[PDB]
Amino acid sequence: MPKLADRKLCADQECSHPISMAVALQDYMAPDCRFLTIHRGQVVYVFSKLKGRGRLFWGGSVQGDYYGDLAARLGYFPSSIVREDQTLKPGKVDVKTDKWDFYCQ
């Protein structure tokens, strides 16, 4: 399975800080373990934005039901299914993707 992208944009070198908070406008079911499953209205925190050949996809995690809860797992989803509501930190750190980046969590 080829990497989805060779490079990505993050808020920091380790992609540890979220770039943005977004709300899902469409449902999306993960086609394989690399992807997130999302439903309309759910909140997603975006930690990376892929570049190049993977640029339709962003990486992040789904907010849970209790205040402050964010699932630990990261996965990819199409950027178009969400509306970014708050830019938390500019996503302008241009990083090569590593092998952890497409290994399923």
Numbering used by the authors: 3 to 107
What did the paper state?
Melanoma inhibitory activity (MIA), an extracellular 11 kDa protein highly expressed and secreted by melanoma cells after their malignant transformation, is known to play a key role in melanoma development, progression, and tumour cell invasion. Structural analysis revealed that MIA is a single domain protein that adopts an Src Homology 3 (SH3) domain-like fold with N- and C-terminal extensions. However, unlike classical SH3 domains, MIA does not bind proline-rich peptide ligands. After its secretion, MIA directly interacts with extracellular matrix molecules, such as laminin, fibronectin, and tenascin; it thereby masks the binding site of cell adhesion receptors, e.g. integrin, to these extracellular matrix components.
